[PDB]
Design a protein around this ligand. Structure first.
Ligand SMILES: COC1=C(OC)C(=O)C(C/C=C(\C)CC/C=C(/C)CC/C=C(\C)CC/C=C(\C)CC/C=C(\C)CC/C=C(\C)CCC=C(C)C)=C(C)C1=O
Ligand code: HEM
Ligand code: HEM
Ligand code: HEM
Ligand SMILES: COC1=C(OC)C(=O)C(C/C=C(\C)CC/C=C(/C)CC/C=C(\C)CC/C=C(\C)CCC=C(C)C)=C(C)C1=O
Ligand SMILES: COC1=C(OC)C(=O)C(C/C=C(\C)CC/C=C(\C)CC/C=C(\C)CC/C=C(/C)CCC=C(C)C)=C(C)C1=O
Lengths: 28, 53, 64, 387, 244, 55, 69, 57, 125, 49, 49, 53
């Protein structure tokens, strides 16, 4: 049951990177 | 982004020669892939024969 | 009023006394024409190169 | 073993070639930081290509628009001043890194057998870099660009019979004009890709026998994998190079250049001072030391001939200058001579620089004439220095 | 001849924008621009500069909007096919004093008053040379004669310039009441000319300080990473059998 | 643990450097300042006969 | 061709050693080692450049004086 | 640093996210610090400090 | 009160190094002459002369180092800042003393003491 | 060679010999023949997305 | 032809118009689009090799 | 192919800055790598001040 946690952990990283490369603070 | 042909189509309005979008008298899309009607700019009549955009 | 450049050039002369005298020495030796050939460009350049170096670090303090 | 199952993915056919040539390639463990300039030159080539492709998105190769398009790059496109300064100063960094790379090969005699083909491919690369950088300098169409292209295309006139027709064929007419500028742009987009292929063959030739080491000895007993030991050593050089590059880009973007290129090209009046980029100055100096048209061009060709014949001279069996005191001393004199030639090229053609340039040119060619003599005499060192 | 050919070397002045963390004096840019449009612009073009460039640097948006409207810019052709004239806009370039190069030479005795958009970058020691040239009009040395139409300037190569002296005392009136001496106008105009040649300098310098500092931290980490991976090799003990 | 902490500090810079260089290339392809300065004007017009279209 | 070898190697974990202190260790002897072995090489590189540069400035200074009235 | 190790370094997904956040916040903090030094070294020289700003006839 | 010179920061550093080397040579000569010879070098002339020349060379090198780094750092501090005070030269004296005399004495407190003394002797100038 | 020397313009359209006009639009805007099958699939669906 | 294909990105709801403008280099097909298309047309054949 | 500057050189003629070719007043090469004198084209006068090249 650690593949699911691996997916959730990498999803946070993908979200964190997306907000980091594109910084849409003036759009939210 | 193409330019519809005046006096063409099957609705008496504008026909887009690129992918067959049909617009009526009011510039409203009726048949074709175009989702919206023709954009209306900001215009006003300063006199009987004077427009401005 | 009065140009700060022109004043500072005058007050820097005691720091460039040696080139000024040499330029004056050249002027006397060339007062003869010799077919309009002699000049004192080098002595002129040395004198002003000293004056300009003296004026540059103090000019901009008087300007805004 | 029987490869029935799949072990590490690096050994799979998808990445086996990359693994053997990059990650696990055997490298001498005693390589110094002077062996990191090969990767630096590769990174400089990539930087030049990437910045150049995006600059070509805004540049117009027309004599009526070339100068203004560069100024439009600097002033209008967002971050265009950075791309232009990265590209303009990147060419200087490329030559700085490659010049240090060549001198490492001279000091450690890395041209010697069995690495003659590696050196020869490097000389071809150096010629490609010179032509690429030169025609790129013509693109802004400044005063430096116009008068620079005028004489290099005129070098073909040294040939007696067909020299004039080659000059007019290179020009595309009877003078350096829009035809010259337009064809220089096409070649400036193509030659960088040929440089990539030449560097790959250069790399492949070196991997046949492996890299030389500071001691110049057989190194098969103490080799280690390139990853991660020489990756992390190359990474230190890359960051240090970036600091060096950033200083030039952000604080001295025009020191390695001449202000005359900021004047639009005027075919009527030549500038009082007319010099190439700094990395072409040593070649400029050898050209101007010969008081002859054909002799000057011949000496330029003799420079690359001597660089090509270096690996094939009958030499002694000792490579590194750290064990060859006479050769080591001559190397430092050659380095000082190459520095002097570059400084001489920046000087106007008059006394005493004519005599100095002639002597410096003679000393440069004397290095390649004395080295084979050192090898033949040095062959008898083991038979004369007995225990 | 020998030394007049290269000209007299300009000194090194302490410009306010010199230094790794120094910006332009934006008050001096606005003052320098008024000098340009009242003295220089009658004979020198600035074809690379637009009115929108001064916005946020020396003027407000409406200040430059009114400024552009004062000039008459050729436009067209209209529906009937004739070139007409319209007031200037923010996107318009600065006006040209002459219609072409030949007209400029004819009005200046065969000499061309070069474009000043990149002059501080198109001369060796650009900022210092321009200031020295403008304020360096004086009498020729003994034994040297100037032809009519030429004026002596030691900093100009050859010493004979077709420029007449234009930075005379009180040649301009400043909006802020600054006394418009020759040296003061000379410093303001080079400040404005410096900005026009390199308008990105302030952003460039901020980027340099930020990223050279950041890369210096990366260099320190790069050394730790290399010495951590190599420590197992550099501290290893090797026992061999050979002696000599 | 200390080594991983120190190495992450330099990893901060590497990610930022890569992000800056990639973004600088991308924004260079966006609309230039001379293009943006020509995005707002006004034009007056007259009259046309019935049943027609003027562009 | 691979090399046949007979050696014994002892190595220590990278996480059991100090990493940076060795750069600033026996500094004076590194300066001694660098200078004492490379002083001939530095002389053969610096002297021709400085000697030639100085001579050119000396030549141009005397030449400039000779052409002055 | 073992307490911090047990929270961030345990999984590479968390470690990668930590690096992304450090680059984001670290660059913002350095940018703010550089701007403060820039302003302090250039007092009275900015466009906002022009006395006659907005007063052109 | 100072208007008799032609200056030149590079020339200043070169001449300072030369003057320091001369002073160090003379000082080393005096030091070598003042000391006696060891008992196993009294019937032999050459080693005493070799030791004297070595002392001259060592002290000339050290004093040239002081006289060069002092002037160079003083000028580099007064150039990059473009202000003339006794604060510039104080830092140069500090760094020259600290660096060279701590290299020779092989100690950090000795380097600090030398730097402080040199800074004071330049502040009184 | 048959195309280059005897039929050099049949594989294209004559409208590319008219200089670009952003105001008027051709009544027949088609791609090169080798993009036609992809073009037909695009036009079949009565929705841009 | 360029006016249509560069408008395909507009099918994206959120950033479709942003990509179209960035692809154009402006608010319409103009010199910015042609200049960037020429550079890409020289580079892509080498990637294809 | 460069342009020799006037009133320069060692012979009172022209001096080419590119590689130090000296031309005398008649345009003849006297010093430098240039192998030929400057090329004199076909020309003629009309009355006293109209030179046709
Ligand atoms: C009536 O109307 C129509 C036409 O008119 C007549 C047609 O002719 C066609 C035919 C056309 C086609 C079949 C082509 C459509 C397909 C594609 C894939 C579009 C082709 C793609 C493009 C035009 C896009 C061009 C690509 C780019 C701009 C790439 C941008 C990115 C770049 C340059 C790199 C990005 C940078 C970074 C990531 C930064 C870091 C990079 C480094 C290298 C370091 C159709 C359908 C049509 O209906
Ligand atoms: C395919 C890759 C490349 C492309 C597309 C390219 C494109 C360009 C373009 C468009 C310019 C003109 C814009 C400008 O002046 O800044 C230019 C200038 C230049 N390029 Fe390149 N280039 C490439 C690779 C290289 C390489 C590998 C070198 C070095 C050997 C180089 C050296 C130069 C130089 C020196 C200039 C003139 C810089 C200046 O403005 O002073 N380029 N290049
Ligand atoms: C495009 C520029 C170049 C690139 C990218 C390049 C790349 C490399 C690389 C990666 C290596 C192996 C690692 C190293 O020793 O640094 C190497 C080795 C070498 N290169 Fe180059 N090189 C270039 C130009 C040249 C030039 C101009 C020469 C000289 C003619 C040259 C001569 C050599 C030699 C002799 C070696 C073997 C060095 C040794 O193992 O000791 N290279 N090159
Ligand atoms: C404050 C006002 C002005 C400034 C700052 C200025 C700036 C300059 C600069 C930087 C040069 C270049 C010198 C060189 O090439 O070395 C120059 C040349 C020249 N200027 Fe202007 N300018 C001004 C006004 C004028 C005016 C009012 C005139 C004519 C009435 C004029 C006519 C010329 C001419 C003819 C040249 C070329 C002279 C030659 O090449 O012999 N300038 N100017
Ligand atoms: C003052 O004067 C001078 C300059 O000026 C300022 C210079 O800069 C330089 C700098 C030039 C150097 C060092 C040499 C450049 C070398 C070469 C080989 C350039 C010649 C190449 C050209 C013109 C383009 C190549 C053309 C090709 C391949 C034809 C294409 C054909 C086909 C694909 C079939 C020198 C020497 C100089 O003295
Ligand atoms: C033990 O061996 C190795 C070395 O010592 C011999 C090295 O020094 C290096 C580091 C240096 C290298 C690889 C320099 C090579 C540079 C070249 C060929 C020029 C620039 C490279 C380009 C443009 C990449 C081209 C290659 C490919 C596959 C095309 C796809 C690439 C891209 C799209 C970017 C590496 C990785 C290595 O392993």
């Amino acid at each position: 049951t650690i593949d699911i946690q691996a997916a959730a952990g990498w999803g946070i990283a993908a979200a964190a990177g997306a907000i980091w490369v594109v910084q849409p603070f003036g759009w939210i | 982004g193409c330019i519809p042909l005046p006096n063409a189509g099957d609705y008496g309005g504008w026909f887009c020669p690129c992918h067959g979008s049909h617009y009526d008298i009011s510039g409203r899309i009726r048949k074709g892939p175009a989702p919206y009607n023709l954009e209306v700019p900001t215009y006003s009549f300063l006199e009987e024969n004077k427009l401005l955009i | 009023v009065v140009d700060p450049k022109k004043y500072l050039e005058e007050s820097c002369k005691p720091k460039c006394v040696k080139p000024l005298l040499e330029y004056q020495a050249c002027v006397k030796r060339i007062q003869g024409d010799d077919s309009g050939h002699k000049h004192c460009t080098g002595q002129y350049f040395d004198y002003w190169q000293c004056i300009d170096k003296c004026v540059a670090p103090k000019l901009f303090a008087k300007l805004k | 073993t029987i490869r029935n199952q799949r072990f590490s993915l690096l050994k799979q056919p998808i990445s086996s070639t990359l693994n053997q040539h990059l990650v696990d390639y055997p490298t001498p463990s005693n390589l110094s930081y002077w062996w990191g300039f090969g990767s630096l030159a590769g990174i400089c080539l990539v930087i030049q290509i990437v910045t150049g492709v995006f600059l070509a998105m805004h540049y117009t190769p027309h004599v009526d628009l070339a100068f203004n398009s560069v100024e439009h790059i600097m002033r209008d496109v967002e971050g265009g001043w950075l791309l232009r300064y990265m590209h303009a100063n990147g060419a200087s960094m490329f030559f700085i890194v490659v010049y240090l790379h060549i001198f490492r090969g001279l000091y450690y005699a890395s041209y010697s057998s069995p690495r003659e083909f590696v050196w020869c491919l490097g000389v071809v690369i150096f010629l490609l870099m010179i032509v690429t950088a030169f025609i790129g300098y013509v693109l802004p169409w400044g005063q430096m660009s116009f008068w620079g292209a005028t004489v290099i295309t005129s070098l073909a006139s040294a040939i007696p019979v067909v020299g004039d027709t080659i000059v007019t064929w290179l020009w595309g007419g009877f003078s350096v004009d829009n035809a010259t500028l337009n064809r220089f742009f096409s070649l400036h987009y193509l030659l960088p890709f040929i440089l990539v292929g030449a560097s790959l063959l250069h790399l492949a030739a070196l991997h046949q026998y492996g890299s030389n080491n500071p001691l110049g000895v057989h190194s098969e007993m103490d080799k280690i994998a390139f990853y991660p030991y020489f990756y992390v050593k190359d990474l230190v050089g890359w960051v240090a190079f970036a600091i060096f590059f950033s200083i030039w880009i952000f604080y001295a973007p025009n020191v390695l250049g001449h202000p005359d290129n900021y004047i639009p090209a005027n075919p009527m009046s030549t500038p009082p001072h007319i010099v190439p980029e700094w990395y072409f100055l040593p070649i400029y100096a050898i050209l101007r030391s010969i008081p002859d048209k054909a002799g000057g061009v011949a000496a330029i060709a003799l420079v690359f001939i001597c660089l090509l014949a270096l690996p094939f001279f009958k030499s002694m069996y000792v490579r590194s200058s750290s064990f060859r005191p006479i050769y080591q001393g001559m190397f430092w004199l050659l380095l000082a001579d190459c520095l002097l030639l570059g400084w001489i090229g920046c000087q106007p053609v008059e006394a005493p620089f004519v005599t100095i340039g002639q002597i410096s040119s003679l000393v440069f060619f004397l290095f390649f004439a004395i080295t084979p003599i050192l090898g033949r005499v040095g062959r008898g060192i083991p038979n004369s220095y007995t225990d | 001849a020998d030394e007049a050919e290269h000209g007299l070397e300009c000194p090194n002045y302490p410009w306010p924008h010199e230094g790794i963390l120094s910006s332009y004096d934006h008050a001096s840019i606005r003052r320098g621009h008024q000098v340009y449009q009242q003295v220089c612009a009658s004979c020198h073009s600035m074809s690379l500069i637009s009115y929108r460039d001064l916005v946020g640097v020396a003027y407000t948006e409406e200040e430059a909007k009114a400024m552009a409207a004062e000039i008459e810019v050729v436009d067209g052709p209209n529906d009937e096919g004739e070139m007409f004239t319209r007031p200037g806009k923010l996107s318009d370039r600065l006006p040209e004093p002459y219609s072409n190069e030949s007209a400029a030479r004819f009005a200046n005795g065969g000499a061309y008053p070069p474009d000043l958009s990149l002059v501080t970058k198109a001369r060796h020691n650009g900022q210092n040379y321009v200031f020295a040239l403008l304020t360096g009009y004086r009498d020729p040395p003994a034994g040297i004669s100037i032809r009519e139409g030429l004026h002596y300037n030691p900093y100009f190569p050859g010493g004979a310039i077709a420029m007449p002296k234009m930075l005379n005392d009180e040649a301009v009136e400043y909006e802020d009441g600054t006394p418009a001496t020759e040296a003061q106008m000379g410093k303001d105009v080079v400040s404005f000319l410096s900005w026009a040649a390199e308008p990105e300098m302030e952003e460039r310098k901020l980027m340099g300080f930020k990223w050279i500092f950041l890369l210096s931290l990366a260099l320190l980490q790069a050394a730790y990473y290399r010495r951590l991976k190599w420590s197992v090799l550099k501290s290893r003990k090797l026992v061999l059998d050979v002696v000599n | 643990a200390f080594a991983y902490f120190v190495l992450s500090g330099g990893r901060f810079v590497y990610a930022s450097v890569l992000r800056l260089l990639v973004l600088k290339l991308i924004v260079s392809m966006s609309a230039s300042k001379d293009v943006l300065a020509l995005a707002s004007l006004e034009v007056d017009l007259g009259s046309i006969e019935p049943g027609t279209t003027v562009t | 061709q691979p090399v046949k070898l007979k050696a014994v190697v002892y190595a220590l974990s990278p996480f059991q050693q100090k990493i940076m202190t060795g750069l600033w260790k026996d500094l004076p002897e590194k300066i001694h080692h660098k200078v004492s072995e490379n002083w001939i090489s530095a002389t053969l590189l610096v002297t021709p450049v400085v000697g030639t540069y100085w001579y050119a400035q000396y030549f141009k200074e005397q030449e400039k004086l000779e052409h002055r009235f | 640093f073992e307490g911090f190790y047990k929270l961030i370094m345990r999984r590479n997904s968390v470690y990668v996210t930590f690096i992304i956040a450090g680059a984001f916040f670290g660059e913002r903090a350095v940018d703010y610090g550089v701007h403060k030094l820039w302003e302090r070294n250039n007092v009275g020289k900015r466009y906002e400090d022009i006395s006659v700003l907005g007063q052109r006839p | 009160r100072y208007l008799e010179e032609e200056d030149g920061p590079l020339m200043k550093t070169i001449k300072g190094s030369i003057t320091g080397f001369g002073a160090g040579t003379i000082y080393g000569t005096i030091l070598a002459t003042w000391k006696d010879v060891p008992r196993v070098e009294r019937n032999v002339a050459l080693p005493g002369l070799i030791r004297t020349l070595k002392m001259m060379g060592t002290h000339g090198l050290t004093f040239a180092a002081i006289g060069g780094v002092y002037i160079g750092v003083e000028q580099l501090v007064q150039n990059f800042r473009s202000k003339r005070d006794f604060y510039n030269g104080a830092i140069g004296g500090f760094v020259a003393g600290a660096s060279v005399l701590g290299y020779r004495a092989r100690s950090i407190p000795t380097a600090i003491a030398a730097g402080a003394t040199l800074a004071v002797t330049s502040a009184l100038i």
